[PDB]
Write a protein that binds this ligand. Structure first.
Ligand SMILES: *[C@@H]1O[C@H](CO)[C@@H](O)[C@H](O)[C@H]1NC(C)=O
Ligand SMILES: *[C@@H]1O[C@H](CO)[C@@H](O)[C@H](O)[C@H]1NC(C)=O
Ligand SMILES: *[C@@H]1O[C@H](CO)[C@@H](O)[C@H](O)[C@H]1NC(C)=O
Ligand SMILES: *[C@@H]1O[C@H](CO)[C@@H](O)[C@H](O)[C@H]1NC(C)=O
Ligand SMILES: *[C@@H]1O[C@H](CO)[C@@H](O)[C@H](O)[C@H]1NC(C)=O
Ligand SMILES: *[C@@H]1O[C@H](CO)[C@@H](O)[C@H](O)[C@H]1NC(C)=O
Lengths: 450, 450, 450
């Protein structure tokens, strides 16, 4: 149920019909692995099945020593320039710091003695979920101790050698990811947290039923917005913090704004003036205001659900939406940029394509079964994605999205015609309708002086 | 056969001698894996060789269930601001959408019954290559059914346990990549498509012999420009779309433009004016025009072959090349920027290094066996890579490329001297030679008024 | 021992107390793997243990052929616009090129005959460390030749089949990484160089004892700043160059500068003027000057040690530090930007948070156990991280860093009040205090004309 409207007057289009899924907070969980403390590998036997077990214990001990070197380092990692600067893992690292305090590990270790999942209140008072995901201590001590603890080693069966390599592999891969990521990984792989464990962790979290359903049906998105932070390894326990997203805003209207340069079409080369709406990005109603996301990557779309991160957003009054139907409205000052760079390009929207065609550029739209069906004249135009498969601007061939949905072409005079090119400011990168008007007055006043 | 020319007048250099390899389209292929439908693991025997087989089937079924959660989400993912906005996987996703239609899977499944490679015309009419790369259904049903389908399970040999883990591993790794990439991966790994399968897929594609030779000798580049899109999993078939690049433009001349700030060298601190050519990047002749690639990553160089993506390009008239030999030419308006920020830096070209040395900065060029061999005075200068191994600008040490090739130093008066610093605009980021001239006239006219 | 100072006058904060770890050069080492030359797999026996060995040799030969296709391609890969352009792997590639010369491999192969580590002087004269990390030739020829070299193949034990898959796996993973990275990988994984081999390689390098201690305690950072460059594969030897960082500057003072927009707080909407210090980033004393790193990613912090890369830096006079205590100082011209965009945001510093609150925005600071404890008025303010856990600006919730350290609030009149909004330039992106003053004079002079 996605719709789109193109505004010929402002060379821009809005895609409506989306639902919000904004990350507004973080939930920190502590994931543990019970380790076996092995120092000496006591066996002088040259048996082939013992040698393969000795070689896997060396890999095991190498990973332990490798992780111990990571815990000794406190781990870390148009209108985009207007944002702030957050600290993404500031919450998770804070939990990682507490686990270094004395006895804090013993709290975790004792709570995870009978069950593999428990809720622990730390010394500072925060209630974190704790999960023991692997008990290599139990396996090594019950299945491998009678082998490599005496001098007359008992030769294991071939099946145990294979089984130990499987169980040890997860530890090795967790160590591998932390080694090439300085102890902070994102997204969180299935080695840090399996699809079963993650879903189970979501169900046990203190969140609403709407958040549980949302997170469970989009765990791949949950992983891309999660961090895995190596913390400690001591007292036979490896602990790393998993920082999961909290979606405080769900199911509010979202819309995406696409913009393209709007220039004059005079045949004289340098006598053209351009103008581009700069407020392009994702917009989502949020607590009476509008959360605006100017960057491309910060929002991921899954069907009609938009997952965004508020740390890369601005908070604007809802009147910002008035710029779509009336860019000259007196309630909000719509942001634009100006130039004399009349160069051709295209923007692929959710349900169509905007084409800014200028100069000697060949701009067309094609179908697979029939070829060219529309040829654009100079200016800014738009074509729906129904019956159109590709758009061509110069030597560039853009495929359009085949998402189903109705588009609407809103006819209107391109607002660039309302300006006189002799008093038009054309070097404005962070400007607005009013900043241009007041700047034209100053130029127009100095002309009135003559 | 790479050459380079440095232009002292404009503080810029051009590297010629390259050949084009531009991605201009996409080819979509459907890769399938025949799966076995296993529900109940019927065996109450505690045999060690059966237990290892049961543990691998659980991993198998976990990957199947994990993939089923991915298919329920329609998957997605100086002069750089001038480009447009494409939708990279719009073509592949379109094919991924068709595979959800009724019976479309049965078409694929039936065509891949006798052979593992076939050409299928879908319901919409497009002809796509289809490849069955793994038949776990055949392996599980022929090698594993007589084990875990009765209640008196037949204990397999140890060799089958090892063989099943190998064949199941590819499915697990494909699932792993799609889990941490929201169903869209790039580059395409050897798990999605092995070097043998990819080469075979290229040879069977409906393309020219030049494209086949080009793609086969640079498959590592082909992978970096390809996408793997998870599609469907039903009726015992896992299908994912692989989106491969089409190189419509091959073997045309390409050249790379390097630019650096050109400032005045007055000893008074703030009395200096700067000027930098902004049209830097890769240029490739293309269909009578020139494809310009302003960003760094969009083009990858392999020997003398330049692989670029047209979606991140502009289409300029061929006269843009005139800016190199004459920046004041009357046919094309060469783009520049201005500032008063006289700060030192260097640009490592293909066959040398440009040095913009200003103020109290120590700028040198060194050889490993002899140390400093040249000391730069203030201004913009250039040194060939023959006999030079490193360049130093301040506290920064740049190694130069040791690619073989002749360089040419084109003497000329730095054009920054032709301007008077009192009417010089110094806040222009998107400007040109003519925009500066007409702006100097307006400032010069208001001075004539006095 | 980290401290922080906030400057209310300039809406900026400086975090002191850090120690430098600047990458200033590169060390190139050659890592080799002795390969076995296998062509024909002579065995017509259908034994299950032979079949598993034949299947692993095919994977082995596939990786060899895959690597041979990579070596045939010479491999490659606010104030940020002011930097230069280096060539990161120019040093490593230079070594990779020399290994293609005749007999250069024989030098390496002969030197690594008795030991697995040797120092080799190449034909050009450079002394590089060389390390043989895997001898598959020795394993295949001693453990696998009596099997697949006769026609009456001798069936191996099951333990050898498992052992061969382990030793062959490293070669396969090295091949895997080079396939999806065009022969150049970063960071350097434990497959290219294990934690034991890397530490051993560091200890044998011709560097100081301070560099050895620094590199060994932060090998995860060493990996993130290293490259692995596929070179050659011929004469039964696979060789790839590992490019390691050299830290020429260690333990000098470093400090991080945070800045935020400073605007006027008039209730009239568009009558406000803004101003933002643009010199934000990392600063480290370096050889009498100051190395300035304007970008975020180029510096990684581990406790109080800052690892930076000089290739992404500028070299400024030490007087740049005067802008913190006096932005109007006459020795250095402090860089700023101007706008009329009064929009709310926050910057999370090392020990607190700057809040730029304007208009109808709700800006607060909270504690977990008590909720809101401070409400910001319009303007630019600051709050320490002691007793504060989160900051909220609009719909955005920022967690603050809980690093221990003292903060200091330096009271002062916001310098934006000293300007008259009628002659204030508000479109300056690359400007400074003096450029603004001289621009106000020109506007003020034309007003004096009337
Ligand atoms: C569009 O949306 C409404 C509510 O989502 C739904 O009831 C309606 O059926 C949808 N239209 C179509 C054609 O399905
Ligand atoms: C400023 O410009 C606006 C629109 O361009 C106009 O309505 C207004 O009268 C001007 N003001 C002055 C003082 O010229
Ligand atoms: C330079 O190029 C031409 C054509 O590529 C070739 O014939 C010529 O031999 C090359 N020069 C050298 C020195 O090899
Ligand atoms: C504008 O400037 C150009 C070059 O600076 C000059 O040739 C031309 O005569 C000027 N035009 C006017 C009207 O001053
Ligand atoms: C702060 O630093 C100095 C030197 O690093 C150290 O001697 C002092 O003890 C530190 N302060 C505290 C409270 O530890
Ligand atoms: C320029 O401005 C500065 C400060 O704004 C002032 O001290 C100086 O006198 C001015 N110069 C002229 C010529 O007006």
């Amino acid at each position: 149920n996605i719709t789109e409207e193109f505004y010929q007057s402002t060379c821009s289009a809005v895609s409506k019909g989306y639902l919000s899924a904004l990350r507004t907070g973080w939930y920190t969980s502590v994931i543990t692995i019970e380790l076996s403390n092995i120092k000496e590998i006591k066996c002088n036997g040259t048996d082939a099945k013992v040698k393969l077990i000795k070689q896997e214990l060396d890999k095991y001990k190498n990973a332990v020593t490798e992780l111990q070197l990571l815990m000794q380092s406190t781990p870390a990692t148009f209108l985009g320039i207007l944002l702030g600067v957050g600290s993404a893992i500031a919450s998770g690292v804070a939990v990682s710091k507490v686990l270094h305090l004395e006895g804090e590990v013993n709290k975790i270790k004792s709570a995870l003695l009978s069950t593999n999942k428990a809720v622990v209140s730390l010394s500072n008072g925060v209630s974190v979920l704790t999960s023991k995901v692997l008990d290599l201590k139990n396996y090594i001590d019950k299945q491998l101790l009678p082998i490599v603890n005496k001098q007359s080693c008992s030769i294991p069966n071939i099946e145990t050698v294979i089984e130990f390599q499987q169980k040890n592999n997860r530890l090795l891969e967790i160590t591998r990811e932390f080694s090439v990521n300085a102890g902070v990984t994102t997204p969180v792989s299935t080695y840090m947290l399996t699809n079963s464990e993650l879903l189970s962790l979501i169900n046990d979290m203190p969140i609403t039923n709407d958040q549980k359903k949302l997170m469970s049906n989009n765990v791949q998105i949950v992983r891309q917005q999660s961090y895995s932070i190596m913390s400690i390894i001591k007292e036979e326990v490896l602990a790393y913090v998993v920082q999961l997203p909290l979606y405080g805003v769900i199911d509010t209207p979202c819309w995406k704004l696409h913009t393209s340069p709007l220039c004059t079409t005079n045949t004289k080369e340098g006598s053209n003036i351009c103008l581009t709406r700069t407020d392009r990005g994702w917009y989502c109603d949020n607590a009476g205001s509008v959360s605006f996301f100017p960057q491309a990557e910060t929002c991921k779309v899954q069907s009609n659900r938009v997952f965004c991160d508020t740390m890369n957003s601005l908070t604007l009054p809802s009147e910002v939406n008035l710029c779509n139907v009336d860019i000259f409205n007196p309630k909000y000052d719509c942001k634009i940029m100006t130039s004399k760079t009349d160069v051709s390009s295209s923007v692929i929207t959710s349900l169509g394509a905007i084409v800014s065609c200028y100069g000697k550029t060949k701009c067309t739209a094609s179908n697979k079964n029939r070829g060219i069906i529309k040829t654009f004249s100079n200016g800014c135009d738009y074509v729906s994605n129904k019956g159109v498969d590709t758009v061509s601007v110069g030597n560039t061939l853009y495929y359009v999205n085949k998402q189903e949905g109705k588009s609407l072409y809103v006819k209107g005079e391109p607002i660039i015609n309302f300006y006189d090119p002799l008093v038009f400011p054309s070097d404005e990168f962070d400007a607005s309708i009013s900043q241009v008007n007041e700047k034209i007055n100053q130029s127009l006043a100095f002309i009135r002086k003559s």
